[PDB]
Design a protein around this ligand. Sequence first.
Ligand code: DGD
Ligand code: CLA
Ligand code: CLA
Ligand code: CLA
Ligand code: CLA
Ligand code: BCR
Ligand code: BCR
Ligand code: OEX
Ligand code: CL
Ligand code: CL
Lengths: 240, 448, 188, 97, 48, 57, 50, 101, 144, 34
Amino acid sequence: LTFDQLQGLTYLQVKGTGIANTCPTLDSGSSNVKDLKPGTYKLGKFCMEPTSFTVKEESQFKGGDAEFVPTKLMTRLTYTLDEMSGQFKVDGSGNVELKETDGIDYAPVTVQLPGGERVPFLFSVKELDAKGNADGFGGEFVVPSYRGATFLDPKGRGAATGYDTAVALPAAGDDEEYLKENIKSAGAMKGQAVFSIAKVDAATGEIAGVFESVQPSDTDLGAKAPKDVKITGLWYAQLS
Amino acid sequence: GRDQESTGFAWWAGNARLINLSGKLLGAHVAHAGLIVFWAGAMNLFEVAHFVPEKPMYEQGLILLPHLATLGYGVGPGGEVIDTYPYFVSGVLHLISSAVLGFGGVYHSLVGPETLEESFPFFGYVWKDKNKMTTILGIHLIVLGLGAWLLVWKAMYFGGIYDTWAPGGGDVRIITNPTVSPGVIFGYLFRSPFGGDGWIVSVDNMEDVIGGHIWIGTLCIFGGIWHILTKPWAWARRAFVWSGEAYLSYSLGAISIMGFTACCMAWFNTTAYPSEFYGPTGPEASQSQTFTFLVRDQRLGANVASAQGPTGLGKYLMRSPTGEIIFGGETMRFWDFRGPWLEPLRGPNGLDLNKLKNDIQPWQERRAAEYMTHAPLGSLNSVGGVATEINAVNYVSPRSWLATSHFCLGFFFFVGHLWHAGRARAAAAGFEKGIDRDNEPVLSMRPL
Amino acid sequence: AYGDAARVFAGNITNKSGFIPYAGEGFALLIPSKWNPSKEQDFPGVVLRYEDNGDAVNNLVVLVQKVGKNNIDELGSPDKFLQDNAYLFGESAAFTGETLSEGGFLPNKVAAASVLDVQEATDKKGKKYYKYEVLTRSADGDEGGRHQLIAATVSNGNLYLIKVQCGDKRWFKGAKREAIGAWDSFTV
Amino acid sequence: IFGVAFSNKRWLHFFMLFVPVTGLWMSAIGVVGLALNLRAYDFVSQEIRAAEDPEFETFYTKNILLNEGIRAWMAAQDQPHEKLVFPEEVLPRGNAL
Amino acid sequence: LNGFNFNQSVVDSQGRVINTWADIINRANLGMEVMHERNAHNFPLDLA
Amino acid sequence: XXXXXXXXXXXXXXXXXXXXXXXXXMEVNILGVIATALFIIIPTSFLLILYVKTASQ
Amino acid sequence: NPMWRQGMFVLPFMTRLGITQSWGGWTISGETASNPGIWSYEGVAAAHII
Amino acid sequence: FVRRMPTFFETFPVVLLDKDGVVRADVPFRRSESKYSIEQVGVSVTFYGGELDGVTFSDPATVKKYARRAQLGEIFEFDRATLQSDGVFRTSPRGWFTFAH
Amino acid sequence: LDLFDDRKARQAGFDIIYEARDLDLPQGVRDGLAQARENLDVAKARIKEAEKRIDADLDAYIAKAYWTEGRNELRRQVGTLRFDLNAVADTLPKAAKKEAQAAKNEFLAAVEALDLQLRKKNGDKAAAALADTKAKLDAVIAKL
Amino acid sequence: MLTLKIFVYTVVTFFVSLFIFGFLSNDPGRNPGQ
Ligand SMILES: CCCCCCCCCCCCCCCCCC(=O)OC[C@H](CO[C@@H]1O[C@H](CO[C@H]2O[C@H](CO)[C@H](O)[C@H](O)[C@H]2O)[C@H](O)[C@H](O)[C@H]1O)OC(=O)CCCCCCCCCCCCCCCCC
Ligand code: CLA
Ligand code: CLA
Ligand code: CLA
Ligand code: CLA
Ligand SMILES: CC1=C(/C=C/C(C)=C/C=C/C(C)=C/C=C/C=C(C)/C=C/C=C(C)/C=C/C2=C(C)CCCC2(C)C)C(C)(C)CCC1
Ligand SMILES: CC1=C(/C=C/C(C)=C/C=C/C(C)=C\C=C/C=C(C)/C=C/C=C(C)/C=C/C2=C(C)CCCC2(C)C)C(C)(C)CCC1
Ligand code: OEX
Ligand SMILES: [Cl-]
Ligand SMILES: [Cl-]
C-alpha cells in the first residue's frame, strides 16, 4: 500500500492483518534521482522491511563455501524497522549520504536453520551512515548486544547484575570449566549495509529502493560465536 | 404452609413444595422481586450517603452509581460528578416500589389463592401445557423488548447516554445514528471470544451499543409475538423436558452464561463500563504504567523509540506479533487495549512515534498516571496493591468486585443447571427417588 | 507487675503523626514511624541509619564528617558540592565492561543520576543548607528509579548531611510524605 | 464411564483407608529426611548442564531461582539469631520488579 | 482480588510496626516476587 | 593453586583406590551390566513362572 | 561421517528406496530440505509405529 | 571476616564483616549502583600457612573467588578430576546412618 | 554515579504524573480540573488552541482522506474542550449563561456530526460538516 | 494451512452436528423408565 492508502485505513481495519509490518510502496515518481534538489533534507518515516533472512553456515564439505543457507522465521511479523529519522544529503552529481539518528531501527529476530538451530539476531541499523552514489550508497552501522547488560541467564548470572559464578555448584563453581559462562559481556558489534534508490517522488519528497545488510548474530552475551546474517528487503523514506 | 408429612420434601427443600401451587409460587417470585428492588434502592441510598466529591467513583466502593453515571445522570464532561440528586431519586423510587412489590408478594403467598387455575384461568397454568407456557414466555419476552427500547429511547430522545469516546472529551451525548447494519451486529455475535476479538465484550462505541439494543428490542417483540401466537413444534416437543423444574434449569443455564459475560464485561469493556466511573481495567493500568514511564523518561532525556530493554526487546515501544507498534514490557499481552486516552495517540499502524514525542497532552498524562495507581489489584480486606503491599491504601477496584462476584454467581448457577436439569429428567422418567428393587434396569442388561 | 490498666475505651492514639522525633548529637530530625534502626554503615561517618520495614530501599542516613570549615559555601557551590559527593548515590565500580544496549543511558553506562532540584535554603537561625533532589535510574530499573532527598550543612567544622532514599514505586504510592517530612525535619 | 469399577464392597472401603494412611506415612518419611537436610533439592545433571550453556532453561531451574529469593529475603527476619545484615545490593532480584 | 493482607497491621503506641507471622510470610512473598520472571519486567509495578 | 593441584597427583596417589594395582578398565562396556542382568532375570522369571504354576497342581 | 560410519542400520534401507529428507530440514545428501512432506525419515518412522 | 554460610542455606550471599560485626564489603548482586563492592573497598586476601603462604591477591576477581571459598570454612584444594566430581556436597556416613535408622 | 542536570525537567510538567498520583490531593487537583477553573486564562488559552486545530488541521485531513488523523485531532488537545467551554460559561452571568450554553450545544452537535462523517469516511459530507463546525465554534467563542 | 483449517472446520462441524441432532432425536425418551 502507498502511504496515503495506509492513512485511509483505521487501526481496527489494520490490526491483525500484517499491513503494520510493511513499508509503504512508492508509486508514481521516477527512477532518476536527479529530480531531487541538491541539498540537505530531514529524513522521516524511514522504513526497512526485510524480504529474506539468510545465515552464513560453515561448509563441512570443505572448500570454504560459507554459503548463506535459507532460514525459517520463528518470531512472526515483528521484524521491520520503521519511523526512523535522520539526515539525507543529495549532491548535484547524485552522491547520497544517509545518516539515521533515532526511530525503531532495531528489532529482535529469531530464525531457524535446517537442523533445528534457532539463531537469534538483533536486526538493527543503529547509527547508519551510508555514503555513495544513488545506485549503491552503503555504510556501516552499529549492532548492539542482543541481550542487555542486566539480562539474567537461567542461573542468575549476568554482566551488570547477577552472580559471577555457578552458585548451584558451591564447590565446582569458578572452575575453568564454567569460567567462560560465569563471565558475561555486553559489548556491541558492527555490520555493513548497502542501499539503492530504485524510485523517487520529488513532488512528495519520497524515495524508495532495496537494501542488503550483513550483520553478526547474537553472541549469547559473549558465550557463543556469532554468525553472519544477510538481510535483504525494501526501504522507504520521506524527505522533508 | 405445608410439611414433610404431606409433601415428602424436607424443610431444607421447602420451596420445592410450591412447584404445583401456582398462587403461592406467584407470591414467592413477586416477593423475591421486591427483595431485588429493595436492594437496588437501599444500596443506591447507601452509596449516595457515603459519596464524597473529593474522590472518584471507583475509589469509594460504589457499583450502582457508576451504572447511573453511564446512563448520563449527574455527570459532566470528563466524567466529573456534578450532581447527586438524580442518584437519590433513583434510590428512593426503587425503595418505595419494593414496598408495594413486597405487599403483593406477601399477599399472593399467604392470603391469596393457592392455585390460580380455577379462579383465574388467564393466569392459571400447568407446567405440561406447552401452549400456555409459550404464551407466558411470549408475554415476558415482550416486556423485555420494551425494556431494551427504553435504553435506546433514553440514548436518543431523553438526555442521551454517557459517551467516553465522545469527540472533545467524554461526556453525555445524544445518539443520533445507531449502528443497525446486520453485518456489524452479526460481527459481534459470531466473532471468537479470544484475544483481539473478545466476542460481544469488544463493542467499542455507543452507536453499536444502542444499535444492538435496537435489534434486541425488535427481536424480543417479534419473538414475544411469535411465541404467543404459536406452540412448540414436533421437533421441540421431543427435544425438551416439559416440567416446572426443567424450565428452571433452562434459565439457570442461560443465566449462567450471562453471569460469565457480565464478569468479562466489567473486566475488559471500557465503553459500557467507562473507566471514569468503574476505574481502569487490568489492561488499561498495565498500558498506563509503560505510558507514564515513557513520558517521564522522555522528559529526563531518552529516545524511547530506540531504548533497548534488558531482553533486547523495546523497553518502551515494540511490535506486536502482527506488526503494530505497541508499548513494551509485560504489557505486550495487553496490546489489544483501546482507551479514550491512548487512542488519540494511535495511528493506522499503531502508536505514533511523532505523537508520542511531541503531541502528548497533559490530560492524557494525568489520566494514565491516575489509572496506574488504581489498578484492579487489591486484597480481600481491601488493601490496594500487589500481595506484597503494606496497609496504606484502602482500595479495591469496582471491576474487581463485579468480575469476581458475578463469576462466582455465574459458576454456582451453572451447577444449578447441572442439578435442576439432571433432576428434571430423572423426575420425569420416574427414577429420581431411587432404583426400583423389583426391576433394576442393569439386571435386565446383558453382562459387560 | 507493671499494674497499668489496658487502654480500653481510650479514644486517642498516642502518636499518629507518622514521625517519631529523634535527638542526635548536634542534629535533630523526625524519623518516620514505620522505619526500623539499621545497623549497617554505607558511607564514612554514618551516625544514624533507619530503613523502612516494608522496603529496605526506603532508608535515611545522617553523615557527620570533620571538614575544618565554617559555612557550607566554603565547600563549594551547591553544584560543585554535589559533584564532589557523588559517592552518596553509589558507584558502578564492579561493572567495568562496555555496553550499548542500555536504552536510556549513555554508552558504557548502567546507572545515571538526574538532579531535579538544588536549593540554598536557610534555617531559622541563619544556617545555610544545600538541599538536593535527585532521581537515580539504573539499567535494571529497580523500583523504577530512586528518589534521593539530600540536605547538608557544616557546623563546628563537621559537615552534617541527610540522605533519604525512596524507591519510585513507593514515592507515588505515598512514601513521599515520610521521605520529604524527614528531609525537611533535618536540623543541625 | 471410567473403564474400571469396584466389584467388591469390602475392597472399596479398605482402599478408602489405605490411600490416605499410606500418603501421610510417605510424607512423614520425607520430613524425616528433611530433619537431616537430606533433601531432594536439585537435579545435578540439569544444574551442571545449565552452568555450561546459558540457553538451557527448564521450569526446575526457574524454581531454583525462586528459592534463592525466598532464602535471601526471608532469612534476616525469619532467623534473627543469625544476625544477618544483608545490604540491599547483595539480595538477588530481577530487573525492575 | 487477593487474599488477606495483614502487613504492618500491628503497630505500637509511637507508630512503630510490630511484625507478625503475616509479615514473615510477606518477606517470603517479596523473595518470590522479585525473582520470578527476571528478564520480563521493565517497570516496578507488576500490574500484568 | 594449580601447581599444588598437580603436585598431589604426581606425588602420593589420589583416593577411592582400585581393585589390585589397576582395575578401572573404563573401556568395559558397562552396558554389559544391563545386558547381563536382563539376560539373567528375564529368562529366569520365565522359568520360575512355569515351575510354580506346575508345582502347584 | 556417512550413515555407514555411524552404525545406522535401517536408515540406509529407507534411503535406498527414496527417503532422503527429514522434518528437521536436512537432506541425506547435505542440501537443504524442500517441503519434506509426510514421507520423511520421521514420517516413515511414525507410519510404521501407527 | 567472611560471614560463614549457615547449614540451612543451599546458597548464601557473600558478605565481609569487620571485628565489631559491621558489614564492610560484599560481592553485590546489583553492580549498577553498589556501595560495598570489594572494588570500592579494595579488599585483598593474604594466606597464612598451608600451600599458599605469604601469597597475597589484590585483583578483585581472585579476591571474590576466595571470599566465596572462605564462607565454606577453611580453604582446601580438591581433586575434582579423578572421580569426575560434580561439585555438590554429599552426606557423611553419620548422615546416612541417621536417616536410615 | 555520573551526574546529570534535569532542573528544567520540572518545568514543562515533570510533576504532572506525580501530582496525578497523590491520593492526598482532591480528585479535581489530581485530574487538573480545579487548576483550569482556578485560572480561566489557562482554560481560555486551551479554547483558543482548540480553535486553531479545527480551523487549520482538520481541513487537510479531510482533503487528503486521513480519516483516523482527523478523528484523533478531534480528540487530542480537544479532549478538554468540553470542560473548558463549561468552565468559561459558568463564569458568565446567568442571563448570558443560557445563551452560551445554547450556542455550545449547537457546536457540540456539529462536532459530533463531523466525527460521524469521518467514521463513515464520507469526504463530501465531512467537508460540509467541518464548515458548519467551524461556523458554530466561532459563535460559541464570541459569546464566551 | 488453509487446507488444514478447512479439514478442521469439516471435522468440528461433523461432530457438533452429531451432538446437536443426537439430542434432537427424542433423547429424553431414551431411558429405562416406564
Ligand atoms: C465448570 C464450569 C466452567 C465454566 C467456565 C466458564 C468460563 C467463563 C468464560 C466463558 C464461558 C462462558 C460463556 C461465554 C461468556 C462470555 C465470554 C466472553 O465474553 O469472551 C470474551 C471475554 C473477553 O475477551 C476480551 O475482550 C476484550 C475486548 O476489549 C476491547 O474492547 C473493549 C470495549 O471497548 C475495550 O475497548 C478494550 O480496551 C478493548 O481491548 C479484548 O478484545 C480481549 O483481547 C479479549 O480477550 O473473555 C475471553 O476472552 C474468553 C476467552 C475464550 C474462552 C477461554 C478459552 C476457552 C476455550 C474453549 C475451547 C476453544 C474454543 C471454543 C470456545 C468457544 C466456542 C464458541
Ligand atoms: C433462581 C434459581 C433457583 C431456583 C428458583 C431454585 C429453586 C429450587 N431449588 Mg435450587 N439451586 C440453584 C438455583 C435455584 N434453585 C443453584 C444456583 C444451585 C447451585 C448451588 C442450586 C442447588 C439446589 C440443590 C442442591 C437443591 C435445590 C433445590 C431447589 C428446590 C427447593 C429449594 C429450597 O427449598 O430452598 C431452600 C433454601 C435453603 C436450604 C437455604 C440454604 C441456602 C444456602 C445454604 C445459603 C446461601 C446463602 C449464601 C450467602 C450464598 C453464598 C453464595 C456465594 C458463595 C456466591 C426449588 C424448587 C432442592 C431440590 O432439588 O428440590 C427438589 C435441592 O436439593 N437447588
Ligand atoms: C426469597 C425467599 C423466600 C420466599 C419469597 C419464600 C416464599 C414462600 N415459602 Mg419459603 N423458604 C425459604 C425462602 C423463601 N420462601 C428458605 C431460605 C427456606 C429454607 C429455610 C424456605 C423454606 C420453606 C418451607 C419449608 C416452606 C416454605 C414455604 C413458602 C411459601 C409459603 C410460606 C407460608 O405460607 O408460610 C407462612 C410464613 C409465615 C406466616 C411467616 C410470616 C413472615 C412474613 C411472611 C414475612 C414478612 C416480613 C416483611 C418485613 C413484611 C413485608 C410486608 C410489606 C407490606 C412491607 C411461600 C410462597 C411453604 C410452602 O411450601 O408452602 C406450601 C413451606 O412449607 N419455604
Ligand atoms: C446477591 C445477588 C446479586 C446482586 C446484589 C447483584 C448486583 C448487580 N448485578 Mg447481578 N446477577 C446475579 C446476582 C446479583 N447481582 C445473578 C445470580 C446473576 C446470574 C448469574 C446475575 C447476573 C448479572 C448480569 C448479567 C449483570 C449483573 C449486573 C449487576 C449490577 C447492576 C444490576 C443491574 O443494573 O441490573 C439490571 C437492572 C434492572 C433489571 C432494572 C432496570 C430495568 C430497566 C429496563 C432499565 C431501564 C432504565 C431506563 C433507560 C432509565 C430511563 C427511563 C426513561 C428516561 C427511558 C449490580 C451491582 C450487571 C453488571 O454490572 O455487570 C457486571 C450485569 O450486566 N448481574
Ligand atoms: C428468552 C427468550 C426465548 C426463549 C426462552 C425461547 C424458547 C423457545 N423458542 Mg424462541 N425466539 C425468541 C426467544 C426465545 N425463545 C426470539 C427473541 C425469537 C425471534 C428471533 C424467537 C423465535 C423462535 C422461533 C422461530 C422458534 C422458536 C422456538 C422456541 C422453542 C424451541 C427451543 C429451541 O429449540 O431453541 C434452541 C435453539 C436452537 C436449536 C438453534 C440455536 C441458535 C441460537 C440462537 C444460537 C445462534 C446465536 C446467534 C446470535 C443467533 C442469531 C439470530 C439473529 C436474529 C441475531 C423454545 C420453547 C421454536 C418453536 O418451538 O416454535 C414455536 C421455533 O421454531 N423461537
Ligand atoms: C413470602 C415469605 C418470605 C419472604 C417475604 C419477603 C421477601 C417479603 C419482602 C418484603 C419487602 C420487599 C418489603 C419492603 C419494604 C420497604 C419499605 C417499607 C420502604 C420504606 C421507605 C421509607 C420508610 C422511607 C425511606 C426514606 C426516603 C423517603 C428518602 C431517604 C430517606 C429514607 C431512607 C428515610 C419468607 C422468606 C419470610 C418465608 C415466609 C414466606
Ligand atoms: C444488545 C447489544 C448487542 C447484541 C445483540 C443481540 C442480537 C444478541 C442476540 C443473541 C442471540 C440471538 C442468541 C444468543 C445465544 C443463543 C444460545 C446460547 C442458544 C441456546 C440453545 C441451545 C444451547 C440448544 C439447546 C437444545 C437444542 C434444541 C439442540 C440440542 C440440545 C438442546 C436440546 C439442549 C451487540 C453485541 C450488537 C452490542 C452491544 C449490545
Ligand atoms: O507472565 Mn506469568 O507472572 Ca502474571 O504477573 Mn505479570 O505476568 Mn508474568 O509477571 Mn507476574
Ligand atoms: Cl513490564
Ligand atoms: Cl519463575
